[PDB]
Amino acid sequence: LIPSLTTVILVKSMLRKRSFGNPFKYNTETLYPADGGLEGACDMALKLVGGGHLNCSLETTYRSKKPATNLKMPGVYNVDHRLERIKEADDETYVELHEVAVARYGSVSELIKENMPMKLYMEGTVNNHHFKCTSEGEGKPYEGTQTMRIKVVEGGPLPFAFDILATSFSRTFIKHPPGIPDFFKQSFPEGFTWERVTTYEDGGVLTATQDTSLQDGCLIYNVKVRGMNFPANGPVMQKKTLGWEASNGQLTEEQIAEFKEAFSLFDKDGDGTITTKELGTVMRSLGQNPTEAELQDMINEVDADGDGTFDFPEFLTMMARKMSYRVTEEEIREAFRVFDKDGNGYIGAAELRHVMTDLGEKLTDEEVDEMIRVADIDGDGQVNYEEFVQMMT
Ligand SMILES: [Ca+2]
Ligand SMILES: [Ca+2]
Ligand SMILES: [Ca+2]
Ligand SMILES: [Ca+2]
């Protein structure tokens, strides 16, 4: 099968982020410097039973315990997060959470190693109900991954969804690329604090304070949570939540900006309308050689109003449908074929550079190699189907 239009945008996106990861399945925090700390802003969407979402906004403040003079402040940047549930008890009193966190758009603490363990003590109140959780875990602070095994030890089973505590469970594990100073790793040995206010649509408000420190090679998290004004018959207090959407509900401006460039690639005459001819050059530049009818089938997926072409608003809408949906098994196979131009089953550095050029993206040779090495588990220097699929999941 001829790679689909969305597959092409996927691959383009994977390259923009220099990662064989799924680039769509993330939720974005923006970090701004501010009086020698950082301010974090984020929007998140809790899935309800019966469809629909509960939106909240998070405003976090991050302060370092180290003096101002020993810290290289970053610019403004974003962290992309993907929080997942690997295990649970029915009652949500044992919860194993996995997170992936990557800086976008670094520092090396001698104290922060490639595998770090962590331990957390959480105490708090949600609509005056008292509880306690403990956890232990580990991760790879430079690769951006971590696992936390959580227990509720008092106040359980909780009379509210566990979901509202998820973001209160690890900032040292954010992968920061070389260009971005990592305020979190630089804070040690002393560590850092945060205070967060999450405000929900329906008026529930969850505040939390957190101390991070480092005791003899293990990170120690100490967190205080005060949740209030959650509607007593709402989906939080009645446990009618199905987890956090690993996305944003509407497209951000920077998503619209990103996708406008991906559109420009196709729009060779810049008249705002894409034809089979213009899709044709792009498809052929990726090694396909499709017929007019096949190119038309591809435009038919995008062309709502039936006039044979598509414009930018229809293109955008298709990307929104894909952001609210998910990347499929077929799309992953198609994406691999595209990367693997010579069909030998191995994605090499040279292929990445040809494909990169076909899709109007530019990576340095350090970026090209890091993108491979990260996926490359057998160490032969290339990416095979199995390695690719692991990364994409
Ligand atoms: Ca055009
Ligand atoms: Ca149209
Ligand atoms: Ca190859
Ligand atoms: Ca390999």
Author numbering: 6 to 110, 121 to 184, 188 to 411
In the authors' words:
To gain insight into the molecular mechanism of K-GECO1 Ca2+ sensitivity and to assist future protein engineering efforts, we determined the X-ray crystal structure of K-GECO1 in the Ca2+-bound form. The structure was determined to 2.36-Å resolution by molecular replacement. The crystal structure reveals the distinctive features of the ckkap/CaM complex in K-GECO1 (and presumably in other ckkap-based GECIs) relative to other RS20/CaM-based GECIs, including R-GECO1, RCaMP, and GCaMP6. The major difference is that the binding orientation of the ckkap peptide to the CaM domain is opposite to that of RS20 to CaM. Another difference is that the RS20 peptide consists entirely of an α-helix in the CaM-binding region, whereas the CaM-binding region of ckkap consists of both an α-helical segment as well as a hairpin-like loop structure at its C-terminus. Examination of the molecular interactions between the protein and the chromophore at the circular permutation site provides insights into the mechanism of Ca2+-dependent fluorescence modulation. We reason that Asn32 plays a critical role in communicating the Ca2+-dependent conformational change in the ckkap/CaM domain to the chromophore in the cpRFP domain. Saturation mutagenesis of Asn32 of K-GECO1 resulted in a library of variants that all had dimmer fluorescence and/or a smaller Ca2+-induced fluorescence intensity fold change. These results indicate that Asn is the optimal residue in this position. The X-ray crystal structure of K-GECO1 suggests that the indicator has a self-contained fluorescence modulation mechanism, similar to that proposed for R-GECO1.
Genetically encoded calcium ion (Ca2+) indicators (GECIs) are indispensable tools for measuring Ca2+ dynamics and neuronal activities in vitro and in vivo. Red fluorescent protein (RFP)-based GECIs have inherent advantages relative to green fluorescent protein-based GECIs due to the longer wavelength light used for excitation. Here we report our efforts to design, engineer, characterize, and validate a new red GECI, K-GECO1, based on the eqFP578 variant FusionRed. The other distinctive feature of K-GECO1 is the use of the ckkap peptide as the CaM binding partner for the Ca2+-binding motif.
